[PDB]
């Protein structure tokens, strides 16, 4: 008798644990699937903010940005002409569903830039999502 | 009627501060309860997913995904 | 009489041992299921730390890292351009739920690197989880 | 009794094998990087190399090859104008960090090639890291 | 009395068979590696090979094949342009560590192929290690 | 504490010449050991990656990827 | 005595059920291929279909459709250039194995479109498989 009752328990338990894992897999879908992103529109600009012979050079990155997602997002880094820059001061944030010009200040992480007036540099902006967007910036002066 | 005995979040043990919530026979419903870390200090990040396992008075444990909203 | 009493004991014992194993299987789920990981954001950089004609070359790997899990984690190895490197000095550690730039020093395990200024190398960072993440590092100089 | 004891063994073994496969998937990643170690720079040259009255047609091929990996790599095959060619003698190799004009001898496998002085032929070179690369070869005579 | 004595035998046998199956699962793993031993390099060539007035249409096929396994491997079948082909005579083989132009004779199984001079045909070659590989073949006439 | 007992690389068996190394409980380590082919010869290539399987004293084995350095 | 007989029956039944599950898995493979039964080919046209200043704008969607499936399959819905539309008339249906032109009347679900002569618009047509096919319609009206 014993063998068949044990076999039946492990069938019923097998069904329970298997269905629990299938329901778990359906529960992941809202977290992993998430349409919409920050989009970068047109060219941006770089402007020299540095003043008074200060020890650190500071630049100004103005660009037009459209958040197509359902949540507020922020910038976290920029890379320009292959060189990393830190975003000095509070990083700006783009509300859900909104198009804005945004401006923020940056400093080189190491070395110095060699920008030229009217030249165009490729840049990559990284958002709080981990998602990044390639952009073109024109150096104004 | 069956009640929540314990919860573990992302491997970490947690204590249900408030009284155990209970689900009546045959019902489907939302269930809400207050919980506190058993040790240390967690740091949930907005919009990230964590796996709870909730243990009910059957001894049955169910894995579930929670998204942090705070 | 004997046969039926023994048959009944082995039914009841069968139920007990089978339910004990089902409860054990539900007890594994918190250990094996563990969402969230270390995520590597944007490009990192390599910088030459070597000095004074020393016998060992030392490099600097700076990268931005986001721990989405509920526990503190550390780096344990890096492989760059197919070559293994040791993390000289205490390996850095990323607290739960936190985004950080991290920096650590490394030395080749065998041979020598042949990095070139401004070139980009694929790398893999391995964390204490056993989980690893592919990354791109730009050699600065 | 037997059924539950077997279920417990297969549960624990299942966890061990599943974790091993996940770790293996992360362990592959470094090996993918090496597939791009080589590139071919500019046009190369074909030259008829065989001695007077000799049975074998043999050609000298010269190309500039750049190696960016951490190990020496060698030529393994060439396809010229669609024809597969055999490589004669020892294969050449490119040291790990270097860019060099490389020269080697080849002989046709599929039949008789009819190169014309000053004509330009496409080729694909194949290397010991499993990479293939497009090339242009000018037949000098 | 009988019932308990039988239960003891089936408990011990259960442990022995369960452990044997777990060890078998680990014992499979080496055999999986060999499935990727071969790759086909560049275009190959088809050539009409049959003698004047002969009943059989027969073609010569030439391709470069690289073997990276620890054993010799042979060609077992080819499918050209969707048609299955039969292989005539002895199959060719590629020595364990080598890259070679390989030549073999084939004859159509499914009907009459109508190759056109200079046209390019996709093929799948199949090898004695159970692997299949995509190939391109240019019909020379 | 556990030890290695065999390795298979690219489908070929190898013997672990000299004392097999051993890993203490709860510990992470780089380990190094020497091996010889049991039959035939390998045909490794610099920078190429080979699948391998390491077998421990448990009978448990683990798949691995090895890069041939030179 | 009984325990051994029960063990034997469950061993034999185990073999049968395991084989049945393996055969069932292959039985799904033909069924899932029905998801690809329809192809939309060539380019379609869209033309004014309303008259006499009637209250509804109505149009004509002519397309060529090939059905590779074993059953007659029908148009469930259409979306034109991102906009939802309703098929006024009864759903058209494509018989098994046929290639044919298909023509049907359609109306905007909301607002007012303004197709311009000779411009191209992308329809996606959804068939009773749940399969959706993108197609280009040129406006003729
Ligand atoms: C953005 O604005 C920044 C601040 O004005 C500029 O950085 C400053 O550049 C000065 C020289 O300018 C020229 O040369 C650069 C290459 O070195 C080039 O990128 C520029 O486009 C421009 O052609 C520099 O002056 C230093 O160097 C001069 C020689 O080049 C020398 O004459 C100066 O005496 C001085 O050493 C600034 O450096 C700082 O100068 C301070 C004195 S003063 O120059 O203000 O009178 C001194 O006290 C301080 O120690 C020294 O560091 C330099 N400023 C900084 C912070 O580095 C930058 O060029 C502008 N453009 C871009 C694209 O970044
Ligand atoms: C990172 O920094 C490291 C330390 O400065 C660099 O390693 C050092 O490289 C020196 C040569 O530099 C050039 O050649 C390299 C290839 O060999 C190349 O990777 C570099 O990009 C660069 O073009 C080397 O100097 C040795 O070799 C010279 C010939 O190449 C020769 O002129 C020197 O006399 C010397 O032999 C360094 O080696 C060490 O040199 C000591 C004397 S001194 O050079 O400091 O004056 C000597 O006492 C010592 O025994 C010898 O080993 C070499 N240092 C080390 C520790 O290996 C490295 O190139 C930099 N870049 C990268 C990408 O790693
Ligand atoms: C590479 O160089 C080799 C010599 O180093 C060449 O071999 C020589 O080929 C000559 C003809 O080449 C033509 O025909 C080939 C097939 O035979 C063909 O593959 C080539 O692409 C090309 O179209 C050959 O000349 C013989 O044949 C001629 C007719 O084809 C005839 O006019 C000649 O008189 C001669 O019989 C060479 O043979 C040698 O010729 C010597 C005299 S001379 O031709 O140098 O004036 C003669 O003394 C000698 O006995 C005879 O064998 C043959 N060998 C040599 C040493 O020249 C090979 O074709 C080259 N391949 C390419 C692709 O350029
Ligand atoms: C095809 O490739 C072959 C190698 O794969 C080449 O063989 C090499 O030929 C070099 C001289 O070739 C010159 O003269 C030919 C007439 O004899 C002419 O057809 C060629 O076009 C070319 O103008 C030879 O170099 C010798 O002369 C050099 C001075 O010019 C001197 O520096 C060298 O030391 C040598 O004496 C090559 O030399 C051999 O060199 C070996 C070292 S290495 O050159 O490979 O680095 C050395 O170990 C050996 O002892 C020596 O004999 C010679 N190389 C080989 C491997 O044989 C052939 O010329 C190429 N053909 C064409 C038409 O270009
Ligand atoms: C591979 O090579 C074989 C010869 O080595 C070819 O066999 C020859 O095929 C000729 C026609 O080929 C065409 O028709 C085939 C079906 O018959 C078809 O499979 C081919 O793809 C191609 O479309 C055939 O020519 C005969 O038929 C012609 C009409 O189709 C007619 O115009 C000819 O006069 C002739 O009757 C060959 O037969 C031989 O022709 C000799 C004269 S000549 O044609 O060489 O000028 C004649 O003397 C002889 O009696 C007669 O049998 C036939 N055999 C030979 C030796 O040429 C085969 O088709 C090739 N396959 C491919 C794919 O290219
Ligand atoms: C299709 O494949 C067949 C093999 O599967 C080929 O048969 C081989 O033909 C070689 C010569 O072919 C040349 O001449 C043909 C006209 O007769 C022409 O149609 C071809 O396009 C090609 O130009 C033959 O090689 C001989 O000649 C060589 C010099 O060119 C010499 O080096 C060889 O030793 C040989 O004398 C092949 O030779 C046979 O070779 C055997 C060794 S191996 O070559 O297989 O390594 C040897 O054991 C045997 O005794 C000898 O007779 C010959 N191979 C076979 C197996 O028959 C056929 O040409 C291919 N057809 C085409 C159109 O390419
Ligand atoms: C497809 O054909 C349809 C019917 O022929 C067109 O829809 C009808 O368009 C009439 C005017 O057409 C002009 O304006 C359109 C935008 O409204 C434009 O797309 C056309 O290209 C063209 O430039 C419209 O008539 C109304 O508006 C006129 C002014 O534009 C005015 O003169 C009329 O008196 C009328 O107010 C139709 O609306 C219908 O008109 C009926 C009277 S009559 O026009 O037949 O004399 C009226 O009884 C009815 O209530 C009113 O709805 C309009 N029909 C509909 C259903 O909207 C359509 O533009 C064509 N093209 C496309 C791309 O859809
Ligand atoms: C980077 O961000 C800092 C805040 O995160 C910001 O600090 C603020 O500074 C302003 C005034 O700064 C001026 O003076 C300093 C010298 O003290 C210069 O380096 C600077 O360029 C400006 O000219 C101050 O009003 C405010 O209270 C500060 N805020 C905080 C939170 O401390 C830095 O100024 C900024 N760096 C640059 C170069 O702008
Ligand atoms: C943790 O669990 C307790 C029981 O499960 C619960 O006690 C109940 O408390 C409410 C009123 O609590 C208020 O006042 C206390 C101070 O006494 C605060 O700490 C608390 O935040 C509230 O502001 C009471 O009406 C009820 O009868 C209690 N229930 C029982 C069974 O005793 C605690 O409230 C709960 N902790 C929190 C923060 O809610
Ligand atoms: C690798 O990590 C070591 C610690 O794990 C570290 O030791 C520390 O060294 C610093 C000073 O090191 C300098 O001098 C040595 C020669 O003695 C050079 O090799 C080195 O590059 C530095 O220039 C010392 O202050 C500190 O107390 C040491 N800490 C410990 C725990 O011993 C090594 O320096 C480091 N290697 C490199 C190359 O940085
Ligand atoms: C395989 O393992 C052996 C021990 O299990 C080891 O023996 C030791 O050998 C070393 C010195 O070996 C050198 O010389 C021999 C020739 O005699 C070479 O084959 C070898 O490659 C080395 O170059 C010796 O100091 C030590 O005492 C030996 N230990 C014992 C216990 O005998 C073998 O050397 C080793 N095989 C290889 C190839 O390393």
């Amino acid at each position: 008798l014993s063998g068949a009752i044990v076999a039946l328990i492990l069938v019923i338990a097998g069904v329970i644990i298997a269905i629990a894992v299938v329901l778990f897999a359906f529960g992941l879908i809202p977290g992993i699937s998430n349409q919409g992103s920050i989009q970068v529109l047109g060219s941006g600009t770089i402007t020299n903010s540095t003043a008074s012979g200060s020890s650190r050079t500071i630049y100004n990155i103005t660009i037009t940005v459209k958040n197509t997602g359902t949540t507020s997002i922020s910038v976290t880094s920029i890379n320009i002409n292959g060189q990393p820059f830190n975003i000095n001061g509070t990083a700006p944030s783009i509300p859900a569903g909104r198009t804005q010009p945004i401006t923020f200040e940056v400093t080189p992480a190491s070395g110095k830039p060699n920008f030229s007036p009217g030249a165009s540099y490729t840049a990559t902006i990284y958002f709080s999502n981990g998602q990044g967007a390639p952009a073109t910036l024109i150096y104004q002066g």
Side-chain angles (χ1 to χ4, degrees), chain A:
Chain A
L1 267 69
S2 185
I5 307 303
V6 170
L8 182 60
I9 291 161
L10 296 167
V11 164
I12 294 165
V15 172
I16 295 159
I17 299 166
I19 293 172
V21 169
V22 170
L23 292 173
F24 176 83
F26 289 124
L28 291 175
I29 299 176
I32 69 182
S33 72
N34 187 329
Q35 285 196 242
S37 59
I38 292 206
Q39 292 177 6
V40 174
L41 305 179
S43 309
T45 63
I46 306 146
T47 296
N48 216 334
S49 189
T50 314
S52 305
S54 301
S55 58
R56 66 201 294 247
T57 54
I58 297 99
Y59 302 91
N60 268 54
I61 310 178
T62 299
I63 199 158
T64 302
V65 180
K66 175 179 180 184
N67 180 0
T68 58
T70 55
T71 56
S72 190
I73 286 154
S74 59
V75 302
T76 66
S77 284
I78 190 170
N79 186 296
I80 310 174
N81 197 17
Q83 176 175 28
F85 287 69
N86 308 119
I87 329 284
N88 186 94
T90 55
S93 177
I94 310 82
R98 197 165 301 282
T99 306
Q100 297 186 265
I102 71 172
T103 299
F104 54 96
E105 280 189 309
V106 303
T107 59
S110 60
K112 63 174 169 69
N114 291 298
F115 306 131
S116 178
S120 59
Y121 299 96
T122 54
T124 312
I125 303 88
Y126 288 101
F127 304 98
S128 61
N129 296 334
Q131 182 230 329
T136 292
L137 300 178
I138 295 164
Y139 180 80
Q140 292 296 328

